[PDB]
Design a binder for these strands. Structure first.
Ligand SMILES: [Mg+2]
Ligand SMILES: [Mg+2]
Ligand code: NA
Ligand code: NA
Ligand code: NA
Length: 1206
RNA sequence: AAUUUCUACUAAGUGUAGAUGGAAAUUAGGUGCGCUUGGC
DNA sequence: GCCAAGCGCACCTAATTTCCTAAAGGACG
DNA sequence: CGTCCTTTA
């Protein structure tokens, strides 16, 4: 037979972009320089972005006029049905209609206005925007695009999107109804649960400062009020209710979420918080919070820094004022110096005793002396402690051990902090002195920011320690000889708060960086397309000479200069492209044949018009197959009379009777409405056109076109050549919409790292036995960015006319059903491994297993191993430390992309080698360490058109016949748990499971009560010591425990076998010995057969807490250390059918292993097996019902699968 | 350490291997730090 | 030491939309 | 009436 892969070619179409360098040839550059086309094009890009901004001012005005005047009708019905918890399938459809009607309501409000049509035509530039604007300069900018408004076509599409009624991400209607109305209704539910919590005063504060006293806070949680929140102005008010704002004085006014969090933290509860609404499309309103003016120049920051933080500055004297205050502590009453309860006490507690909570513990101990252990008790103790407003230093002294003195320690600390400020000055006298001027800009001067930040840091650290000694403020007996002075020095120390923020907010800006700009050559529709009839209008074509391809651009004054070039019958010739496209027959045939021009020459019958004007062919409620054939016949005869087409594409249509619908005919026109060929044109004469500057010529270039290129080309190079290859029968088409850019040089060449000619360069690969390379030319780092570069972007279309049309998912289920031995590739996001791969066959035998932390490659017999796990971790640390240091933050997305491109390649190779399907975790780690989402996207992308560059283009899986084994990637939003060959399955207990028996830990073993522990110990069939094995044995029937019904075997004998890694820091624990130590601590005769009743007689709560913890470690099969690839073992407390305990460390040691080599490998293995279970589920089902099989294995089903396979 | 671009390279000497859907628009997320009020 | 709710500033990242056109139509000299 | 920009399906 064939493979399953073989059936997945020519399934659906997609577009890609091929990118190239464009290299000016001959006098092209000089002529561009003389005519000044690049300064023209660079300025146009600046002005173009300016007109878009002005256009947006109008659109936002138009959006607000409409939205401010809209009352949504379907509103109460929608909200009522949206909540109702017993929605039948009828009611779900009903709710869907009201959601549509609400979006239609908004969209019609926009599209209703007069001249809504005019918003996306030249009228808005030439007329409407000039009237709306006032500034004579802004007007002149808009007016400079008269005769160039075609250049805004795409921007106008971007703007129309905003007014779509569709449930689409860029639509205002979508943002109002699908997102903000959904969040608003969710908040109404939250408001009814949470309402009891807010006191009258808190509610009135928001009403007064947030609402202006014009509404009640309850208003914004009633349905009828949603209209208020359709505009940004309203959203901002709503979100202030939720989140509060910062006043002009800096006071943080609290919103509802703050009050919910405080209530939760006060009462140990978990009330839900409100979701804020998203922004309205195209708005930009000021924050309702006040933030002070920030510095703006390298000069001003240096001024503020030297002014306010020099030794003569006041801030400095307050520090010494405060050090003298503490140094003479004994001249002040320690009964009158107060540390406010809260974070100040936490700080002083750590500073003096080593931990934040020591003072609370000493206070709790004294409370216990009077009142002493219920939860009632601890909660009363907490409430009594939280009532205390502050602690005196004298009181603090009574908590100190006999040897420690509290007031001496405070002196010692403040001494240590002022010293550290001096240490930092010792490196900063240079930045301060009058002579100093700076070399590089602060945003790029690392050495000067580190001086500033280290001094700023040392002052902040002193400030926060000082703040602890303020107290509550209103204590009665507080020493004012200390506090009058303290408050004076502290209040000027606070000056550093605005300085610190303002300096940080400036110095951490990335410096500006210019972007490339589009070139138009004075054509508002430049290079829009390649049809020969349009060459004059677009003024751009493609030429070929030998292996080399060229972009040819006709100067505006010489639009016809190329057409006039005949073939040279003797000398050399360029091959000029001859390109014909009939684009989109479903729009192009109506367009011309029902036009004023054509209906003149050739009148359709009144019947044809009526069939078309009413849509009797569209395959809808009014579909009429006889009418569809009559219309097709009119197009056909119109086509024979339209020479521009019938001559270009000698059409060959099926007889009309054979068409089932109008698309059946349109697909024939579309498949034949495309031809590419070459004519000859005199090289001498074409080159003279470039000489005289009537033609501009660029070589279409990447490194594979170099005469020194001799290896496998890039895939994209192959795509580009195949566009013009005779063996390409339409699988890859050249598309319109090409664009040309100028990217100005961004590096200076004399500042690039150079490896000089004739001097040996070190090779970096340690496996490369050739330690050195010596070249006869210079090699420059990032050379390409040290010159101006043209780049050409060329869209292409792949499988424009697909023929293998079927539901991809269904075909996969059908092929698997009838496959004797299907291979699954299990892929797991592990703890110690970015990705882990295990391949299984149809019977679940492991065929390959390895980590993808490192990528292996081999070329010319040379191995290269790239440790990407290490590279990414290095990069994450550089980014983390740069954020904390105010230094440059390096990119990581390219490194993840480069890593994942290697992963994807390896998986495509596994898919092709083993004809295999792919099993993934159905996600429904820490964000910067994450890699899996990018890996999904790039893998799905590749499987939309999967090519092996090594294959012949025309072979299955070659560049003309790519495999399409995932559905066309529209969005993550629209994905199910199957995307062709990729199955997403529940990850539940795929890693934390014994692969050799299926045993899983279903016990709750976190310590709770002494009687709970008794119950837990009593539920085991027996506990005993096994002397012949030196093991403790725990016989259990799962049916005697809560939360158990998922397990299938039920009866297990757990043994204290082996070691475990305890985490808390980490330490190795030997179970049997730890048990023995525990029982011996308490005089338990653990040899006394069944020790169960003996264990329950213990009364010390510390026995049971220690016992439950040992039980936990025993059921902890997964044992790993953070930062250790090599300590990730899986060990079972259960014996298999032959008396053996599964230890992954047995398998990690062997080259090929029957069972998982570690816990992350175990995850990939069982993810794969959950898909094997689903393949077995397709087999039980009949073909016509295959797309109804639930591929998600239930928990109980998995425990039975995993415990029975073995 | 060269690139349409990216990642790893030097790969036998102006490059090697793999990947690469671009443009525009909208919007969201995350990290870090400061401040406010709180919890452990 | 860690953390929550909220505000602010700086930075980097990424999801989801649209187009990937020749020819009719017309404003303009 | 030719050319160049805009609008259409
Ligand atoms: Mg190559
Ligand atoms: Mg590099
Ligand atoms: Na796309
Ligand atoms: Na944001
Ligand atoms: Na943040």
């Amino acid at each position: 037979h064939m493979s399953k892969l073989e059936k997945f070619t020519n399934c659906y179409s997609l577009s890609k972009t091929l990118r190239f360098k464009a290299i000016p040839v001959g006098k092209t550059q000089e002529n561009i320089d003389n005519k000044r086309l690049l300064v023209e094009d660079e300025k146009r890009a600046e002005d173009y972005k300016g007109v878009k901004k002005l256009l947006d001012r109008y659109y936002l005005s138009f959006i607000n006029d409409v939205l401010h005047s809209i009352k949504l009708k379907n509103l109460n019905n929608y909200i009522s049905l949206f909540r109702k918890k017993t929605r039948t399938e009828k009611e779900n459809k009903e709710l869907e209609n009201l959601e549509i009607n609400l979006r239609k309501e908004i969209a019609k409000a926009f599209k209703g206005n007069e001249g809504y049509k005019s918003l996306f035509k030249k009228d808005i530039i030439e007329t409407i925007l000039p009237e709306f604007l006032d500034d004579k300069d802004e007007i002149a900018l808009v007016n400079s695009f008269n005769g160039f408004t075609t250049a805004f076509t795409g921007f106008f599409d971007n703007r129309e999107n905003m007014f779509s009624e569709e449930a689409k991400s860029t639509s205002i209607a979508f943002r109002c109804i699908n997102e903000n109305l959904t969040r608003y209704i969710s908040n109404m539910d939250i408001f009814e649960k949470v309402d009891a919590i807010f006191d009258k005063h808190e509610v009135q504060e928001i009403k007064e400062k947030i609402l202006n006293s014009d509404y009640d806070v309850e208003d914004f949680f009633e349905g009828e009020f949603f209209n208020f929140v359709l505009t940004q102005e309203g959203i901002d008010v709503y979100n202030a209710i939720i989140g509060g704002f910062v006043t002009e004085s800096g006071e943080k006014i609290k919103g509802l979420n703050e009050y919910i969090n405080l209530y939760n933290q006060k009462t140990k509860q978990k009330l839900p918080k409100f979701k804020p609404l998203y922004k309205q499309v195209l708005s930009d309103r000021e924050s309702l919070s006040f933030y002070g003016e920030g510095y703006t120049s390298d000069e001003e920051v240096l001024e503020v820094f030297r002014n306010t933080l020099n030794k003569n500055s006041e801030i400095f004297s307050s520090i010494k004022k405060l050090e003298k205050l503490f140094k003479n502590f004994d001249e002040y009453s320690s009964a009158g110096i107060f540390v406010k309860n809260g974070p100040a006490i936490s700080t002083i507690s750590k500073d003096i005793f080593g931990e934040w909570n020591v003072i609370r513990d000493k206070w709790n101990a004294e409370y216990d002396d009077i009142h002493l252990v219920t939860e009632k008790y601890e909660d009363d103790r907490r409430k009594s402690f939280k009532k205390i407003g502050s602690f005196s230093l004298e009181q603090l002294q009574e908590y100190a051990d006999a040897d420690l003195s509290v007031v001496e320690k405070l002196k010692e600390i403040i001494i240590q902090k002022v010293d550290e400020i001096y240490k930092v000055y010792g490196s900063s006298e240079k930045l301060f002195d009058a002579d100093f001027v700076l070399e590089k800009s602060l945003k790029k001067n690392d050495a000067v920011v580190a001086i500033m930040k280290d001094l700023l840091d040392s002052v902040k650290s002193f400030e926060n320690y000082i703040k602890a000694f303020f107290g509550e403020g209103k204590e009665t007996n507080r020493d004012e000889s200390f506090y009058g002075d303290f408050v004076l020095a502290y209040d000027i120390l606070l000056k550093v708060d605005h300085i610190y923020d303002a300096i940080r907010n400036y110095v951490t800006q990335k410096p500006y960086s210019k972007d490339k700009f589009k070139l138009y050559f004075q054509n508002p529709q430049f290079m829009g397309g390649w049809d020969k009839d349009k060459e004059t209008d677009y003024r751009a074509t493609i030429l070929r000479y030998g292996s080399k391809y060229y972009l040819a651009i006709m100067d505006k004054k010489y639009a016809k200069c190329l057409q006039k070039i005949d073939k040279d019958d003797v000398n050399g010739n360029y091959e000029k492209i001859n390109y014909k496209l009939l684009p989109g027959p479903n729009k192009m045939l109506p367009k011309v044949f029902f036009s004023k021009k054509w209906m003149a020459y050739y009148n359709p019958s009144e019947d044809i018009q009526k069939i078309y004007k009413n849509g009797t062919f569209k395959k809808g409620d009014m579909f009429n197959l006889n009418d569809c054939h009559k219309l097709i016949d009119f197009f056909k005869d119109s086509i024979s009379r339209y020479p521009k087409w019938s001559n270009a594409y000698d059409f060959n249509f099926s007889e009309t009777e054979k068409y089932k619908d109008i698309a059946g005919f349109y697909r024939e026109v579309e498949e034949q409405g495309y031809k590419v060929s070459f004519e000859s044109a005199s090289k001498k004469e074409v080159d003279k056109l470039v000489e005289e500057g009537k033609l501009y010529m660029f070589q279409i270039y990447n490194k594979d076109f170099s005469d020194k290129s001799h290896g496998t080309p890039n895939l994209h190079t192959m795509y580009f050549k195949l566009l013009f290859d005779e063996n390409n029968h339409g699988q890859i088409r050249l598309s319109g919409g090409a664009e040309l850019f100028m990217r100005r040089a961004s590096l200076k060449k004399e500042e690039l790292v150079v490896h000089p000619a004739n001097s040996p360069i070190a090779n970096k690969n340690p496996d490369n036995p050739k330690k050195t390379t010596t070249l006869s030319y210079d090699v420059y780092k990032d050379k390409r960015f040290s010159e101006d570069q043209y780049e050409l972007h060329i869209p292409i279309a792949i499988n424009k006319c697909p023929k293998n049309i079927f539901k991809i998912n269904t075909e996969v289920r059908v092929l698997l059903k009838h496959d004797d031995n299907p291979y699954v590739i299990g892929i797991d996001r592990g703890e110690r491994n970015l990705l882990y791969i295990v391949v299984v066959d149809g019977k679940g035998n492991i065929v390959e297993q390895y980590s993808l932390n490192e990528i292996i490659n081999n070329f010319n017999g040379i191995r290269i191993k790239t440790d990407y796990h290490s590279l990414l971790d290095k990069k994450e640390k550089e980014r983390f430390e740069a954020r904390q240091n105010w230094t440059s933050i390096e990119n990581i997305k390219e490194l993840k992309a480069g890593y994942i491109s290697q992963v994807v390649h390896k998986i495509c190779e596994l898919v092709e080698k083993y004809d295999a399907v792919i099993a993934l975790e159905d996600l429904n780690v820490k964000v910067e360490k994450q890699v899996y989402q990018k890996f999904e996207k790039m893998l799905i992308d590749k499987l939309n058109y999967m090519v092996d560059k090594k294959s012949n283009p025309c072979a299955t899986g070659g560049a003309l016949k790519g495999y399409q084994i995932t559905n066309k990637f529209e969005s993550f939003k629209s994905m199910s748990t199957q995307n062709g060959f990729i199955f997403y399955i529940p990850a539940w207990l795929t890693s934390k499971i014994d692969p050799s028996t299926g045993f899983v830990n279903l016990l709750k073993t976190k310590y709770t009560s002494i009687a709970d522990s008794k119950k837990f110990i009593s539920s085991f069939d027996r506990i005993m010591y096994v002397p012949e094995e030196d093991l403790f044995e725990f016989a259990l029937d799962y049916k005697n425990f809560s939360r158990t019904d998922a397990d299938y075997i039920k009866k297990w004998k757990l043994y204290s076998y082996g070691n475990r890694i305890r985490i808390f820091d980490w330490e190795e624990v030997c179970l049997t010995s730890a048990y023995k130590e525990l029982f011996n601590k308490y005089g338990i005769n653990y040899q006394q057969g069944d020790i169960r009743a003996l264990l329950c007689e213990q009364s010390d709560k510390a026995f049971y807490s220690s016992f439950m913890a040992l039980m936990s470690l025993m059921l902890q099969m997964r044992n790993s250390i953070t930062g250790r690839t090599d300590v990730d073992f899986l060990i079972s407390p259960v014996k298999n059918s032959d008396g053996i305990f599964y230890d992954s460390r047995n398998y990690e040691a062997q080259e090929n292993a029957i069972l998982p080599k570690n816990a992350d490998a175990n995850g990939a293995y069982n993810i794969a097996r959950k898909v094997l279970w689903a393949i077995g589920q397709f087999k039980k089902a009949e073909d016509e019902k295959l797309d109804k099989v639930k591929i998600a294995i239930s928990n109980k089903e998995w425990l039975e699968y995993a415990q029975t396979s073995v």
